[PDB]
Design an enzyme around this catalytic site. Structure first.
Site, PDB file in Angstrom:
ATOM      1  N   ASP A  59       0.821  -1.211   0.000  1.00 13.97           N
ATOM      2  CA  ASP A  59       0.000   0.000   0.000  1.00 13.97           C
ATOM      3  C   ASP A  59       0.858   1.265   0.000  1.00 13.97           C
ATOM      4  OD1 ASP A  59      -2.648   1.453   2.099  1.00 13.97           O
ATOM      5  OD2 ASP A  59      -2.438   1.411  -0.113  1.00 13.97           O
ATOM      6  N   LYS A  85       1.923   4.791  -0.883  1.00 16.95           N
ATOM      7  CA  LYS A  85       1.342   6.019  -1.415  1.00 16.95           C
ATOM      8  C   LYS A  85       1.701   7.158  -0.444  1.00 16.95           C
ATOM      9  CE  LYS A  85      -3.101   4.625   0.757  1.00 16.95           C
ATOM     10  NZ  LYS A  85      -4.536   4.305   0.611  1.00 16.95           N
ATOM     11  N   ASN A 137       0.468   7.368   3.275  1.00 19.50           N
ATOM     12  CA  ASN A 137       0.996   6.441   4.264  1.00 19.50           C
ATOM     13  C   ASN A 137       2.399   6.777   4.726  1.00 19.50           C
ATOM     14  OD1 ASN A 137      -1.320   5.038   4.194  1.00 19.50           O
ATOM     15  ND2 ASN A 137      -0.486   3.221   3.216  1.00 19.50           N
ATOM     16  N   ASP A 165       0.852   2.317   8.401  1.00 20.49           N
ATOM     17  CA  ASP A 165      -0.214   1.554   7.796  1.00 20.49           C
ATOM     18  C   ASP A 165       0.407   0.315   7.183  1.00 20.49           C
ATOM     19  OD1 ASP A 165      -2.541   2.782   8.688  1.00 20.49           O
ATOM     20  OD2 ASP A 165      -2.458   4.318   7.098  1.00 20.49           O
ATOM     21  N   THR A 221      -4.400   0.278  -3.336  1.00 25.31           N
ATOM     22  CA  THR A 221      -5.052   1.516  -3.705  1.00 25.31           C
ATOM     23  C   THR A 221      -5.008   1.648  -5.216  1.00 25.31           C
ATOM     24  OG1 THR A 221      -4.442   2.571  -1.612  1.00 25.31           O
ATOM     25  CG2 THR A 221      -4.977   4.035  -3.415  1.00 25.31           C
TER      26      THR A 221
HETATM   27  C1  LIG Z   1      -3.071   9.972   9.865  1.00 21.94           C
HETATM   28  O1  LIG Z   1      -2.474   8.687  10.011  1.00 21.94           O
HETATM   29  C2  LIG Z   1      -1.470   8.550  10.931  1.00 21.94           C
HETATM   30  C3  LIG Z   1      -0.977   9.596  11.698  1.00 21.94           C
HETATM   31  C4  LIG Z   1       0.076   9.379  12.572  1.00 21.94           C
HETATM   32  C5  LIG Z   1       0.612   8.114  12.670  1.00 21.94           C
HETATM   33 CL1  LIG Z   1       2.058   7.869  13.624  1.00 21.94          CL
HETATM   34  C6  LIG Z   1       0.097   7.059  11.953  1.00 21.94           C
HETATM   35  C7  LIG Z   1      -0.944   7.264  11.048  1.00 21.94           C
HETATM   36  C8  LIG Z   1      -1.482   6.155  10.171  1.00 21.94           C
HETATM   37  N1  LIG Z   1      -1.186   6.472   8.748  1.00 21.94           N
END
Ligand SMILES: COc1ccc(Cl)cc1C[NH3+]
Ligand SMILES: COc1ccc(Cl)cc1C[NH3+]
Lengths: 351, 13
Positions: free
Chosen positions: A167, A169, A172, A185, A202
């Protein structure tokens, strides 16, 4: 040849050292993978929603005892309904527990209750690459190359452990306080010895073999790297349409067009990553990751210096203090309700 | 034209 004696021997020695590193990294991973840190919801204060998806949300939380801030991913068990959704959530937790690399987010706690599954990670306050990229338009080639190098090393690490990421992108990829990337993610990551068959990812980043329902391997991640580098350098991805079905048709075609500002070195790298023919795709050949690392577009990249975080970053996010959320977009704040009755207990026993 | 906002991953297309 392209390299003189001194350069060729330095490169060879460097490549043998990579092998030695990866062998030790596999030993450490397997120890954690075979013999894997809980907490409970009331140990945290909810601060703000940092992102949302189909199955839940990521929240900035503050741990009461220590005062540390964390990103808490909350998955609604009742939303994790589809078969592949369930197995994927077990993959995500188990992989995050076991990996260790400077560009992979660190998991601190995991737990579940009657309603939800929880994974509590290090908070990375610099925001998603996605929003910075959309705000600036596109990154310069040197800046895109700095981020791409971190992804190349991260995939070299993951793939050596037989992990596919699936995934990639900008959404992430978080930017840390030093301007380096943290991959987050792992919902689609999986340990795969050879092929796997789930249709997931995606749309804009899917390799053709996924779309065509063919059993596929780790080379899908190298295709996705091509999509990412293109999007970072152009400001939009190479297969770009309003609806997924139209995106899929463009991907399968074998056709890519490039902005007139792309360097020829960049176009060459991208034509070898965005290669439909798996017998020709960089990352999938006899020389493996070295076809990418030794490509002319990366000639200025000091791979060890990137790994050691000693290269000056393009951008250091502003941070006003612990718990700052200024580098994230705002989201609707919805209730986090926990039922008095256990939901879906049997399907999540392993979590 | 194409999608400029955040893109959701699909678990089972
Ligand atoms: C908005 O998403 C996140 C924000 C902070 C952290 Cl550490 C992890 C995520 C998952 N992508
Ligand atoms: C679109 C979106 C961004 C940029 Cl830089 C160009 C076309």
């Amino acid at each position: 040849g392209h390299m003189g004696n001194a350069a060729a021997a330095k490169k060879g020695s460097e490549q043998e050292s990579v092998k030695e590193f990866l062998a030790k990294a596999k030993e450490e991973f397997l120890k954690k993978w075979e013999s894997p840190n809980t907490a409970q919801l009331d140990h945290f204060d909810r601060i703000k929603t940092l992102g949302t998806g189909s199955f839940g949300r990521v929240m900035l939380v503050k741990h009461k005892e220590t005062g540390n801030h964390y990103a808490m991913k909350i998955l609604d068990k009742q939303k994790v309904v589809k078969l592949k959704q369930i197995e994927h959530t077990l993959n995500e937790k188990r992989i995050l527990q076991a990996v260790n690399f400077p560009f992979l987010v660190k998991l601190e706690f995991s737990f579940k209750d009657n309603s939800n599954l929880y994974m509590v990670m290090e908070y990375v306050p610099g925001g998603e690459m996605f929003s910075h990229l959309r705000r600036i338009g596109r990154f310069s080639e040197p800046h895109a190359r700095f981020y791409a190098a971190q992804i190349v090393l991260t995939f070299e690490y993951l793939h050596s452990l037989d992990l596919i990421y699936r995934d990639l992108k900008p959404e992430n990829l978080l930017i840390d306080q030093q301007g380096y990337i943290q991959v987050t993610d792992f919902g689609f990551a999986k340990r795969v010895k050879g092929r796997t068959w789930t249709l997931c990812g995606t749309p804009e980043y899917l390799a053709p073999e996924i779309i065509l329902s063919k059993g596929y391997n780790k080379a899908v991640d190298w295709w996705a790297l091509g999509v990412l580098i293109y999007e970072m350098a152009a400001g939009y991805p190479p297969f770009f349409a309003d609806q997924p079905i139209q995106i899929y048709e463009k991907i399968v075609s074998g056709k890519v067009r490039f902005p007139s500002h792309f360097s020829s070195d960049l176009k060459d790298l991208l034509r070898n990553l965005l290669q439909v023919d798996l017998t020709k795709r960089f990352g999938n050949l006899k020389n493996g990751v070295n076809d990418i690392k030794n490509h002319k577009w990366f000639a200025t990249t000091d791979w060890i210096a990137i790994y050691q975080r000693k290269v000056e970053a393009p951008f250091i996010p502003k941070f006003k203090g612990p718990g700052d959320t200024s580098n994230f977009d705002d989201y609707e704040e919805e209730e986090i309700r926990v039922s008095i009755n256990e939901k879906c207990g049997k399907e999540f026993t392993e979590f | 034209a194409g999608r400029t906002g955040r893109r959701q991953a699909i678990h089972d297309i």
